[PDB]
Amino acid sequence: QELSIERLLEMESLVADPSEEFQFLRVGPDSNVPPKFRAPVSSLCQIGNKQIAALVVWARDIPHFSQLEMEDQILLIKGSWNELLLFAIAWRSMEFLTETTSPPQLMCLMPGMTLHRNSALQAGVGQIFDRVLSELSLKMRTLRVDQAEYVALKAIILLNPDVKGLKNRQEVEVLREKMFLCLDEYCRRSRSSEEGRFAALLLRLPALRSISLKSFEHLFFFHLVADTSIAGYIRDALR
Amino acid sequence: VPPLTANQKSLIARLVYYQEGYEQPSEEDLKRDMPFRQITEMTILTVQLIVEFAKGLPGFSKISQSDQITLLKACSSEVMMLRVARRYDAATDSVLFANNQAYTRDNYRKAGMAYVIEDLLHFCRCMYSMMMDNVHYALLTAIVIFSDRPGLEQPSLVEEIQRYYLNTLRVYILNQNSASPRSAVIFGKILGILTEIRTLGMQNSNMCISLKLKNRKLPPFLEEIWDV
Numbered sequence: 001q002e003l004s005i006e007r008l009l010e011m012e013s014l015v016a017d018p019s020e021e022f023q024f025l026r027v028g029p030d031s032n033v034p035p036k037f038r039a040p041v042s043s044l045c046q047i048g049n050k051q052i053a054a055l056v057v058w059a060r061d062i063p064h065f066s067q068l069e070m071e072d073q074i075l076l077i078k079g080s081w082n083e084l085l086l087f088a089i090a091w092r093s094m095e096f097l098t099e100t101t102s103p104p105q106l107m108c109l110m111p112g113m114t115l116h117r118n119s120a121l122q123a124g125v126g127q128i129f130d131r132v133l134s135e136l137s138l139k140m141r142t143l144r145v146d147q148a149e150y151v152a153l154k155a156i157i158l159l160n161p162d163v164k165g166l167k168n169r170q171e172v173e174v175l176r177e178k179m180f181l182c183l184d185e186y187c188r189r190s191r192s193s194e195e196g197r198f199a200a201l202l203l204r205l206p207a208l209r210s211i212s213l214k215s216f217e218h219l220f221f222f223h224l225v226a227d228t229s230i231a232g233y234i235r236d237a238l239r
Numbered sequence: 240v241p242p243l244t245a246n247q248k249s250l251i252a253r254l255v256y257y258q259e260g261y262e263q264p265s266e267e268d269l270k271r272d273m274p275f276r277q278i279t280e281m282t283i284l285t286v287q288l289i290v291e292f293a294k295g296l297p298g299f300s301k302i303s304q305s306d307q308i309t310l311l312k313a314c315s316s317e318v319m320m321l322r323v324a325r326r327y328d329a330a331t332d333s334v335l336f337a338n339n340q341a342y343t344r345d346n347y348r349k350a351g352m353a354y355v356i357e358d359l360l361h362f363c364r365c366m367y368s369m370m371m372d373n374v375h376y377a378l379l380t381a382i383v384i385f386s387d388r389p390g391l392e393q394p395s396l397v398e399e400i401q402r403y404y405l406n407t408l409r410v411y412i413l414n415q416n417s418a419s420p421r422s423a424v425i426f427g428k429i430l431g432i433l434t435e436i437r438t439l440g441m442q443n444s445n446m447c448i449s450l451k452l453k454n455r456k457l458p459p460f461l462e463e464i465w466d467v
């Protein structure tokens with residue numbers, strides 16, 4: 001009943017419910033994905049959908065989130081699924097590679113399924129791949145971002161009152177603010193010596209967005225995304 | 240509750256003053272199809288001051304030559320939204336950029352970019368709600384110039400600079416709020432803009448690209464800066 005870096009944390013353990021995997025991603029008919037890879041794309045799609053449900057359910061539980069006018073529950077999730085997967089990927093992807101210099105050739109999609117940079121390439125998307133791991137995966141490595149911090153940022157990326165068309169802007173500003181207060185406090189009461197930590201963290205957020213918008217450029221390109229049905233799917237999933 | 244150093248205090252000073260000067264609404268306007276040319280010419284002048292503002296800034300020269308020009312291509316389109324947005328009059332719900340035929344729900348509509356002005360204004364109400372200072376805004380602009388772009392020679396540099404600014408705006412909003420906790424929230428909502436300025440900035444590039452292959456007169460200056 002209170003939004004805290006504490007609840008948000010124990011709330012990470014809670015595993016999804018592989019009930020209905022809604023098609024947020026799939027290979028459209030007559031898409032321009034070359035047949036011999038039309039099997040692989042689709043399998044990755046199947047992976048990203050499972051994940052989106054893990055996010056729609058995680059969001060639903062977050063303290064107060066469900067006391068939001070339902071119209072809004074949908075716009076905040078629709079408004080962030082994609083940035084939220086890249087964040088979880090770059091987080092996950094931090095262990096696989098500690099690699100003049102060798103670019104980190106690995107990227108983790110979900111446990112025990114790690115994309116390799118060479119097929120990132122063969123797909124032409126090699127550039128968003130390096131951006132993920134260097135701008136996010138790697139820069140989090142150095143920063144030594146702890147798990148508390150990482151669930152805080154999510155909480156923050158979800159509770160965006162800047163989403164167009166929300167029925168109650170204030171009802172989501174307060175939550176977001178409750179997370180800045182938490183994030184700032186934790187940050188001092190922890191790495192006290194670390195000044196500018198609170199801002200060094202909040203700064204991954206605009207990159208996470210550029211990289212996020214980037215991904216869609218590609219996703220729509222190959223007709224992989226189906227943004228039309230999304231809201232409905234989310235709508236359905238909440239309930 | 241450390242007050243600003245003397246160098247911090249002095250910095251905030253150099254910037255408030257050295258901003259009014261490049262007061263976006265420029266007078267050099269001497270223009271001696273659809274009026275797409277107004278929207279367009281304006282933008283040009285505007286971007287032009289921005290590039291200049293982007294210089295007298297206690298950082299630049301330090302950055303390389305070609306490296307910096309990367310900082311402007313990115314920084315410029317976003318930072319322009321900030322200047323237009325700083326003008327949004329609450330009373331009428333519109334940008335009053337010396338209310339030239341510059342950017343209005345009208346011209347924009349006549350020049351077939353109907354959907355766009357709508358979005359600009361959303362982010363306008365949004366920014367108008369935080370009630371930023373003049374220091375807020377200044378510092379903010381700078382923190383956007385030195386925001387880390389893709390392809391920077393030594394991003395480690397642009398990052399210690401930008402952090403200098405970043406600390407001043409924190410210490411500033413800190414005293415301004417006498418060590419209460421609200422400060423972090425205030426500070427937060429500001430960095431919070433930096434992330435939304437990126438969508439608009441990019442929503443932009445994708446706009447040139449659309450006008451570009453729909454046959455339109457986009458000035459070799461814009462096409463340059465925000466290449467297409």
Ligand SMILES: C/C=C/CC/C=C\CC/C=C/CCCCCCC(=O)OC[C@H](COP(=O)(O)OCCN)OC(=O)CCCCCCC/C=C/C/C=C/CCC
Nearest residue numbers: 033034037040044045048119120122123125215218219222
């Ligand atoms: C948010 C993402 C979360 C989970 C992912 C959801 C599914 C999207 C799939 C993207 C994974 C890309 C890497 C793996 C690809 C394997 C297929 C392959 O090698 O295709 C080559 C083919 C050569 O074609 P060819 O050009 O047509 O034909 C000539 C032969 N070259 O390429 C293709 O068929 C292109 C397939 C379309 C890929 C869409 C990219 C979407 C960007 C995802 C964002 C995340 C960043 C990291 C992902 C790398």
Ligand SMILES: Cc1cc(C)cc(C(=O)N(NC(=O)c2ccc3c(c2C)OCCO3)C(C)(C)C)c1
Nearest residue numbers: 279282316319320323355358359439442443446
């Ligand atoms: C006030 C302004 C600011 C800047 C930085 C460039 C131009 C300007 O010159 N134009 N307007 C836009 O780019 C433009 C404007 C606003 C907008 C957009 C676009 C795409 O989409 C996202 C939300 O809002 C063009 C179309 C004439 C290039 C106008």
